[PDB]
Design an enzyme around this catalytic site. Structure first.
Site: not given
Lengths: 222, 244, 243, 241, 54, 43, 250, 243
Positions: A1, A17, A19, A33, A47, A129, A166, A169
């Site tokens: 995220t 994003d 996912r 999100k 988180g 993250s 990453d 994401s």
């Protein structure tokens, strides 16, 4: 995220994003999100994905109630302080990592709130993250006196770097931009770098491929 | 001193009855009339809403008949505001019974819970008693159809035919002659409609101010069908009864 | 029975007698005050009656600064006024702590009116015996004057009067406001509105003021304060020499 | 919440609420109980003002507290079944705490205690009910009949009646019942109870309910077709003699 | 339309126009009837000075 | 009593035009006036 | 110390009617004459703002409020009581539905829930009944447009057209002929304006009339764009300029 | 309706609370007690009446001390003032506990006034029947406030309650006029003794006993203590000299 936010002259813009990851495995590919506290203030969580929506729902209800009570528009400062108090009273047991951006007659604002209650303010800010890759890019490219298209391009570059570098994401890009003069608009699937390709063969099965142990019909209506 | 302003709601009279429930039993008579007939095939609950006008909404409007469970329905006679809290508590108690036993709550249990709620206020707390009396109808495998009644005093008895509200005596006298032990649902319905026609204070009987709740058991066994008669079907039985 | 008039209960005419009698308690001090609304600021002026020479003039005042930005003038018996001032200050504290920004005047007035309404509805409580005039400048809204009452009926005012001669000052200001068709004084400087208010108050009451008969509260942009006696004397001297 | 005292000592010494509850009981339905050598009978009447009351779901005037002890009341019916509920839950708690089925004496003491507490606690009016407790103690065949007053005083009665016109039934039992020579059969006890009732009920065989309590966990409720059977020979023996 | 839909402020005007039309047609009795009906409807409302003058 | 009032008002209306007979349209005027007064005094 | 008034202040009169309820009804029937009528495509609720002193600002006072962006409230009783009622109702509506279900409750359940507070006030000891009568208008995707009137006793009735206040009798007896099965929003607002015309006793203009309409979901006032699920709040309130345009349409 | 004085929170038709008025009337039936605001500090004084000679002299005292710099002298229902000063001491202790600064006099006044009015809002509490002349010295200077049972307090330059309240205030005015520039504590104590003697002339039938105490910065440097030794006798015979 990965969630980022960029503050420009007229207003502020954040991006996220789509996912949702619960660990080594991905739950859903296209999710929202971004959480709405008020029509003029937006929040995006990081988180843990299970405290964000509950906390944002609580704050949105209370903030809209307060604005109705005061018969005036909500203010980002009040929301920030309310998040601070709520997260502090649980004593660091909630891992919610949220971004807060908004505008008011006093001006435009953009802060971040940490899980155990810490707060900070900055023109650019990425939390979560996957925030590292995007925040490096925005620190590399940011400058004074940005424009709306420049700000959204910078946010797109940051989120693209985050999704490429990453695992958690990827997929689509969701962007919300806040304009002082006009209404705040919300972009759904603004960028779609990942598109699932068609399968080489179709896995459609012939009728009656799997045996049925028993046939029955259950009533629904009176 | 906070004494002179007290009314002493829970006080015994010199002869020996309560006075607040005494006046609640008068407030009951000033509310709209309700009728309940116990038939072999089912139970019919009907009531005449009071204060009716051309501007009263009838499309989606039920003020005297309330649903507590898919099998159990009640009729309200009195102050609707005070009846709302009792209805909510009854629904909560029925759902808690389904929580505890996973089986349909018998009517007697809910009737006791509501009677206890009324009695608790009639006993202590110094608050005015609820000025509402209920008519309970439901079904189960215990005693079949059941038709109780409630009072602000909190006492309940079983009845094969009851009518609480305005002109209770006239309705009871009218129904006792025509009541047998073998009616179907339709005979009870027409009897109730005739009683309401002969007890109403207006001249005619228009479909706007009549409400009907019926309990039927047909092809499906073990589950009755609860239907609140809407105005479109309400105006149908008027021609069948001949009142039109 | 006859216990209706003793507590906040409805009456055969549909009236709350206790709340009605509460208003008659607001005129015990017979202190006349008025507040005008300037173009950018607000000024409230109240009579300062010192009964005995043993009083210290500095401590006797019916003007309480609620916060650094919101001022308040209250008419009625002082002890209840001080109770209201304490509650208002504490609630301004609580709101500033919880929401993080200084509250506007209307929110405070509405909250105090709600408190007074809770006082009226609860039988064991008695209604407040004061009439509070909240005065402040709101950068979100503008200059504003808010006046509540023991019942809890609050509403913004172009210009507020009070005291035994509230009606007379009301007509005196209404003639000016209906001839000038403006919702506020056009004087930009807080200097001029003070003399405007003092002149209208003098013409209304028909009395001439000295350094100690009147106390003036001024609420500028993000600032509220009470002028000292020398300031009022200088203003009166300017008025006397000007007209 | 409500802390105001409702029971205040009158200048003449009585408690007005308790002595008003006495009259409240005096307006209730007549309930009578007699005991034989090994049988106790609780007779009761019902209100005949309104008809069309069924029998199956109508709450029985005599409520079963336990398998060996039963209770009958008179006066305000609303408040009495609360005492019934409290007695039942207390009996279950006593079973849990003492590993022994409840005794008539202990249950009657508990009922008198709760009525006394309500006459004591503030903000609560005293109960308007008067109760009769009958049953057999475990491993004992002796019938025990107990009366509990709203004032909180309990006593054993070989034959007691409560409710309206209880004076007539009392004087009737005072001469057609012998304390030292109780009736020896269930039929004799039932006949005495029935003949006692017609002195007041004066027709109403439909709404005369009688419960017969027997030892060894035997509690029966005689139906109408037996009560009218007794009434037949009772009225036959009345007028001819 | 204006009879059932009680609209006396407009009923006055429609009846006055009817009386004018009937007077133009020389059917004086019907014109008088229409005028009297308008007068009946007129003296129960806040009819303006123009219509009372007419 | 309103009927008697209607009749008396019609009789008065016939006088107002200095006429000799009472007409149906004067009855209409009278009943209109009586209705207006009755519905006004109910306030 | 606490509250020593734990006894109910509403006691049944020997005539069989509640005192305080029949007293609050009298307190309601005098005061501002408000009204609201329901049309096919919307509901219009109107009230007149009696400017007490001409030096006051009727803009600061909100005669009509927003319970939810779909449901509005109009009263005809005592000001502060209505204000406290509207604040409490907003709070409990949020608690019951926004916290648990996630959206705004429909009119039918919200009206019962707000009337719960008043029917508790007439029951809980030491307090007096609210002296206000509430006109609730709202819409929902299943039951459609609906208007509800809440009496101080706590009883709520569904009414197609209503009016409460000093002119309640005249407006109620005048609305039957005005109203029919099919109606339009502009037709409804014209009906309301005509009805309120005689019931006002002061100056007539856009400032002295408080008017709100529940109609289609207007997206301009929504405050954001990008979600096709929601299209804006259905509750909008006309300003003085908005209402003094249909005022001369009479 | 009658009975407007039976309860406490009930308002009279003219808007004046009645139990508070009766408490005021109960206050006047008490021992006289004066206080002088000298330039540096305050000087209290009491006239504890000597009953039958069984009472021990110079032992029973009425000038209670709060913290170090606040003194309380009370008249009327002596126990009620005892409880009031007890609560005041608790408030001062809490303030010094959680602020570690000695309570300023106006803050103590606010606390005591808020407590006093808390007892004239309900129907289940009797209003205080004690008037206090509490005062002392703080950082900003000296203050002398009289508290009234209605909850109203004022920053007096001198006050007195008791049987000889009216006589004492006249001599207070005379002293203030005689020394407009100010007054020293040393002369203030003698003047207080003289004032008490003049007030006691109304109660000459019963015997008197004088106790005096003063808080000052010049001598006591912010500490409160009584007057003992030759100073009290000097004040006594100076005041008896003019008689």
């Amino acid at each position: 995220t990965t969630i980022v936010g960029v503050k420009f002259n007229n207003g502020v813009v954040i991006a996220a994003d789509t996912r949702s990851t619960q660990g080594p495995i991905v739950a859903d590919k296209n999710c929202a999100k971004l959480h709405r506290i008020s029509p003029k203030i937006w929040c995006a969580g990081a988180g843990t994905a299970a405290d964000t929506e509950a906390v944002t729902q609580l704050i949105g209800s209370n903030i809209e109630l307060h604005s109705l009570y005061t018969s005036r528009e909500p203010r980002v400062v009040s929301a920030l302080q309310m998040l601070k108090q709520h997260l502090f009273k649980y004593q660091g047991h909630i891992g919610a990592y949220l971004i807060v951006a908004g505008v008011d007659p006093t001006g435009s604002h953009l802060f971040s709130i940490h899980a155990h209650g810490s707060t900070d303010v900055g023109y650019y800010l990425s939390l979560g993250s996957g925030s590292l890759a995007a925040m490096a890019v925005l620190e590399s490219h940011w400058k004074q006196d940005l424009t709306k298209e420049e700000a959204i391009k910078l946010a797109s570059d940051a989120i693209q770097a985050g999704i490429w570098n990453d695992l958690g994401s990827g997929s689509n890009v969701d962007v919300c931009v806040m304009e002082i003069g006009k209404d705040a608009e919300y972009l759904r699937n603004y960028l779609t770098p990942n598109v699932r390709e068609e399968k080489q063969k179709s896995y459609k099965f012939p009728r009656g491929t799997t045996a049925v142990l028993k046939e029955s019909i259950v009533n629904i209506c009176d | 001193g906070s004494r002179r302003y007290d009314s002493r709601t829970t006080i015994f009279s010199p002869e020996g009855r309560l006075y607040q429930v005494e006046y609640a039993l008068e407030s009951i008579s000033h509310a709209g009339t309700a009728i309940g007939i116990m038939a072999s095939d089912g139970i019919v609950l009907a009531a005449e809403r009071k204060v009716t006008s051309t501007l009263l909404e009838q499309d989606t409007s039920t003020e005297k008949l309330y649903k507590l469970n898919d099998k159990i329905a009640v009729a309200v006679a009195g102050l609707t505001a005070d009846a709302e809290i009792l209805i909510n508590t009854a629904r909560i108690h029925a759902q808690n019974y389904l929580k505890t036993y996973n089986e349909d709550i018998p009517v007697e249990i809910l009737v006791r819970r509501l009677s206890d709620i009324k009695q608790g206020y009639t006993q202590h707390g110094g608050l005015r008693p609820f000025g509402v009396s209920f008519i309970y109808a439901g079904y189960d495998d215990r005693y079949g159809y059941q038709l109780y009644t409630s009072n602000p005093s909190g006492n309940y008895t079983g009845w094969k035919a009851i009518s609480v509200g305005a002109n209770t005596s006239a309705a009871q006298t009218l129904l006792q002659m025509d009541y047998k032990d073998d009616m179907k649902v339709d005979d009870a319905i027409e009897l109730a409609l005739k009683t309401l026609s002969k007890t109403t204070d207006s001249s005619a009987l228009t479909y706007d101010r009549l409400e009907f709740a019926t309990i039927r058991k047909g092809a499906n066994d073990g589950e009755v069908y609860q239907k609140i008669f809407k105005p479109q079907e309400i105006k149908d039985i008027l021609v069948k009864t001949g009142i039109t | 029975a006859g216990y209706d008039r003793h507590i906040t209960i409805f009456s055969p005419e549909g009236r709350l007698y206790q709340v009605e009698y509460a208003f008659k308690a607001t005129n015990q001090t017979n202190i006349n005050s008025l507040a005008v609304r300037g173009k950018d600021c607000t000024v409230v002026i109240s009579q300062k009656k010192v009964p005995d020479k043993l009083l210290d003039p500095t401590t006797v005042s019916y003007i309480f600064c609620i916060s650094r930005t919101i001022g308040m003038v209250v008419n009625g018996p002082i002890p209840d006024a001080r109770n209201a001032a304490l509650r208002a200050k504490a609630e301004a504290a609580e709101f500033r702590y919880k929401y993080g920004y200084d509250m506007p005047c209307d929110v405070l007035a509405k909250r105090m009116a709600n408190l007074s309404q809770i006082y009226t509805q609860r039988a064991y409580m008695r209604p407040l015996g004061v009439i509070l005039t909240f005065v402040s400048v709101d950068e979100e809204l503008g200059p504003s004057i808010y006046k509540t009452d023991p019942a809890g009926y609050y509403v913004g005012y172009k210009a507020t009067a009070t005291g035994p001669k509230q009606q007379e000052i009301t007509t005196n200001l209404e003639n000016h406001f209906k001839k000038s068709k403006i919702d506020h004084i056009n004087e930009e400087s807080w200097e001029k509105v003070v003399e405007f208010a003092i002149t209208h108050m003098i013409d209304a009451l028909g009395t001439e003021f000295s350094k100690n008969d009147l106390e003036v509260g001024v609420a500028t942009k993000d600032k509220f304060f009470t002028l000292s006696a020398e300031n009022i004397e200088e203003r009166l001297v300017a008025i006397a020499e000007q007209d | 919440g409500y802390d105001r005292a409702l029971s205040i000592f009158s200048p003449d010494g009585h408690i007005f609420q308790v002595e008003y509850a006495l009259e409240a009981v005096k307006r209730g339905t007549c309930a009578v109980g007699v005991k034989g050598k090994n049988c106790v009978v609780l007779g009761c009447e019902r209100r005949s003002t309104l008809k069309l009351q069924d029998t199956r779901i109508t709450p029985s005037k005599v409520s079963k507290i336990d398998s060996h002890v039963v209770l009958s009341f008179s006066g305000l019916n609303a408040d009495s079944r609360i005492l019934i509920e409290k007695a039942r839950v207390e009996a279950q708690s006593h079973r849990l705490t003492l590993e022994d089925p409840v005794t008539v004496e202990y249950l009657t003491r508990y009922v008198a205690g709760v009525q006394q507490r309500y006459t004591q606690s503030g903000g609560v009016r005293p109960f308007g009910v008067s109760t009769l407790i009958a049953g057999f103690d475990p491993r004992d065949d002796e019938p025990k009949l107990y009366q509990t007053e709203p004032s909180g005083i309990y006593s054993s009665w070989s034959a007691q009646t409560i409710g309206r016109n209880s004076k007539t039934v009392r004087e009737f039992l005072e001469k057609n019942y012998d304390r030292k020579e109780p009736p020896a059969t269930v039929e004799e006890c039932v006949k005495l109870t029935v003949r006692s009732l017609l002195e007041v009920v004066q027709t109403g065989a439909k709404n005369i309910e009688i419960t017969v309590v027997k030892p060894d966990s035997d509690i029966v409720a005689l139906s109408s077709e037996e009560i009218n059977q007794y009434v037949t020979q009772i009225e036959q023996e009345k007028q001819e003699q | 339309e204006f009879k059932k839909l009680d609209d006396k402020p407009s009923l006055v005007d429609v009846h006055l126009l009817e009386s004018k039309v009937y007077h133009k047609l020389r059917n004086l009795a019907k014109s008088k009837a229409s005028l009297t009906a308008a007068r009946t409807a007129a003296n129960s409302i806040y009819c303006p000075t123009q219509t009372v003058a007419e | 009593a309103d009927v008697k009032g209607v009749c008396t008002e019609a009789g008065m209306y016939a006088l107002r035009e200095r006429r000799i007979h009472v007409t149906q349209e004067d009855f209409e005027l009278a009943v209109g006036k009586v209705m207006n007064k009755n519905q006004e005094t109910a306030i | 110390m606490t509250d020593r008034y734990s006894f109910s202040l509403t006691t049944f009169s020997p005539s069989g009617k509640l005192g305080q309820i029949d007293y609050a009804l009298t307190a309601v029937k005098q005061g501002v004459t408000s009204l609201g009528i329901k049309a096919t495509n919307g509901v219009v609720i109107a009230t007149e703002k009696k400017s007490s002193s001409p030096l006051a600002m009727s803009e600061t006072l909100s005669k009509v409020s927003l319970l939810t962006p779909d449901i509005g409230a109009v009263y005809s009783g005592m000001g502060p009581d209505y204000r406290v009622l509207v604040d409490k109702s907003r709070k409990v509506a949020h608690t019951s539905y926004k916290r648990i279900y996630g959206e705004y409750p429909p009119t039918k359940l919200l009206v019962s829930e707000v009337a719960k507070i008043m029917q508790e006030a007439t029951q809980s000891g030491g307090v007096r009944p609210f002296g206000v009568s509430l006109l609730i208008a709202g819409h929902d995707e299943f039951n459609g447009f609906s208007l509800y009137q809440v009496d101080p006793s706590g009883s709520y009735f569904p009414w197609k057209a209503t009016a409460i206040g000093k002119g309640s009798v005249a407006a109620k007896t005048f609305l039957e002929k005005r109203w029919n099965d099919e109606l339009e929003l502009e037709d409804a607002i014209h009906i309301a304006l005509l009805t309120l015309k005689e019931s006002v006793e002061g100056e007539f203009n856009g400032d002295t009339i408080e008017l709100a309409i529940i109609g289609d979901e207007n997206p301009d006032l929504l405050g954001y764009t990008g979600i096709p699920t929601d299209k804006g709040p259905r509750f909008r309130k006309l300003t003085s300029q908005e209402i003094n345009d249909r005022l001369e349409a009479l | 309706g009658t009975g407007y004085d039976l309860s406490n929170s009930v308002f009279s038709p003219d808007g004046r609370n009645f139990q508070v008025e009766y408490a005021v009337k109960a206050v006047e039936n008490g021992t006289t007690s004066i206080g002088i605001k000298c330039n540096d500090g305050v000087v209290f004084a009491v006239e504890k009446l000597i009953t039958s000679k069984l009472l021990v002299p110079q032992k029973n005292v009425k000038i209670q001390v709060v913290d170090r710099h606040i003194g309380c002298v009370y008249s009327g229902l002596i126990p009620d003032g005892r409880h009031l000063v007890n609560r005041g001491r608790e408030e001062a202790a809490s303030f010094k506990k959680l602020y570690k600064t000695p309570i300023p006099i106006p803050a103590f006044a606010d606390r005591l006034g808020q407590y006093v009015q808390a007892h004239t809002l309900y129907n289940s509490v009797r209003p205080f029947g004690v008037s206090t002349i509490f005062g002392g010295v703080d950082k900003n200077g000296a203050h002398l406030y009289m508290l009234e049972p209605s909850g109203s307090y004022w920053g007096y330059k001198g006050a007195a309650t008791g049987k000889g309240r009216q006589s004492a205030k006249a001599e207070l005015e005379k002293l203030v006029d005689h020394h407009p520039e100010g007054l020293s504590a040393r002369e203030a104590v003698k003047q207080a003794a003289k004032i008490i003697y003049l007030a006691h002339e109304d109660n000459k039938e019963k015997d008197f006993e004088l106790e005096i105490s003063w808080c000052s910065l010049s001598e006591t440097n912010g500490l409160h203590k009584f007057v003992k030794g030759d100073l009290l006798q000097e004040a006594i015979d100076f005041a008896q000299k003019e008689i």
